[PDB]
C-alpha cells in the first residue's frame, strides 16, 4: 500500500519521517525539477507524456525526443514561443515563422542578430530546401573513377 495525494510538496514529504524519502514520485514537473535536478525532470516529463498518450501511445523514442529537447538547456523549457527563445535565440526566422513576426523582427533588427541557416523553418523562409535526409550528405562526382573507368 502507498499514499496518492492531491497537491505536491516533495520537500515536506522528504522531511517527514513516517514516509520513504527516496521514493517520492510527484506528478508536477516543476517540483520534480526543482528538488531533483534536470535529469529527474526529464524522466518525469517522459512519464507524464506517456501517461497522457495512454495505451495507444507512440514509441518511447518520441517521448524521449520531447523530454530531451525540452530539457537540453538544464531547465525545463516549454514548447511555446518562450521555450523557442530559450533554446534557439539566434534563429530569428524560426521564431518569426512560429508567431508574432513583427515583434521578433524588430528585436532582431535592433539586436543585429546573425541568424545561421539550419533546421527546417530558417531555410524555408529564405526560399531554400533544408539540409535533411536526401540532402544531408554532399554528393561529389568521382574524379578518378570517371577518369580511369569512364569517358
Amino acid at each position: 500500500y502507498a499514499i496518492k495525494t492531491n497537491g505536491t510538496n516533495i520537500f515536506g514529504a522528504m522531511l517527514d519521517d513516517n514516509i520513504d524519502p527516496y521514493t517520492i514520485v510527484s506528478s508536477s514537473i516543476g517540483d520534480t525539477m526543482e528538488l531533483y535536478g534536470i535529469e529527474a525532470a526529464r524522466q518525469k516529463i517522459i512519464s507524464e507524456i506517456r501517461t497522457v498518450m495512454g495505451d495507444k501511445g507512440p514509441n518511447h523514442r518520441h517521448l524521449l525526443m520531447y523530454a530531451d529537447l525540452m530539457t537540453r538547456t538544464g531547465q525545463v523549457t516549454s514548447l511555446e514561443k518562450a521555450g523557442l527563445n530559450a533554446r534557439e535565440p539566434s534563429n530569428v526566422l524560426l521564431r518569426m515563422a512560429l508567431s508574432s513576426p513583427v515583434q521578433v523582427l524588430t528585436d532582431a533588427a535592433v539586436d543585429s542578430a546573425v541568424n545561421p541557416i539550419y533546421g527546417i523553418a530558417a531555410p524555408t523562409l529564405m526560399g531554400s530546401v533544408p539540409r535533411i535526409g536526401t540532402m544531408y550528405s554532399d554528393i561529389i562526382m568521382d574524379e578518378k573513377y570517371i577518369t580511369e573507368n569512364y569517358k
Binding site: 523582427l105 524588430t106 527546417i120 524555408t124 526560399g127 531554400s128 540532402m135 544531408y136
Partner: protein, 98 residues
C-alpha cells in the same frame, strides 16, 4: 490547389526534399536569386544583356546565384521596406589542399 504547412511537415518527416524542391520551387514560384557575396545584399545579373553589378559595392561585386522562391524574395523586400536590412552571409567556398 495548396501544399500547405502540414504537407511540408510530412514531406520533411519522410526526409523527402527533391520532391519538396519540385513541388514548391519548380512548380509554384521558383526563381533564381543573385547575391553579391561581397556585401550580402541582392544584386543584379542578366546573361543576355550582360549586366553584372550590385548597387551596394559596385566594383567589388562577386555575384553568386541562390535558388529561391518569389515569395521569399517578396518577403525579404517587405522586411527591407520596413527598414530592416536583410543581408545574407552565403556559404563560404571550400577548396582542397594543393
Amino acid at each position: 490547389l495548396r501544399l500547405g504547412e502540414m504537407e511540408h511537415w510530412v514531406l520533411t518527416a519522410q526526409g523527402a526534399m527533391q520532391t519538396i524542391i519540385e513541388k514548391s520551387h519548380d512548380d509554384s514560384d521558383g526563381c533564381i536569386s543573385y547575391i553579391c557575396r561581397n556585401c550580402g545584399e541582392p544584386a543584379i545579373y542578366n546573361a543576355s544583356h550582360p549586366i553584372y553589378k550590385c548597387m551596394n559595392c559596385d566594383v567589388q561585386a562577386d555575384i553568386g546565384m541562390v535558388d529561391s522562391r518569389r515569395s521569399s524574395i517578396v518577403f525579404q523586400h517587405e522586411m527591407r521596406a520596413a527598414n530592416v536590412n536583410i543581408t545574407s552571409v552565403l556559404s563560404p567556398r571550400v577548396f582542397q589542399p594543393a
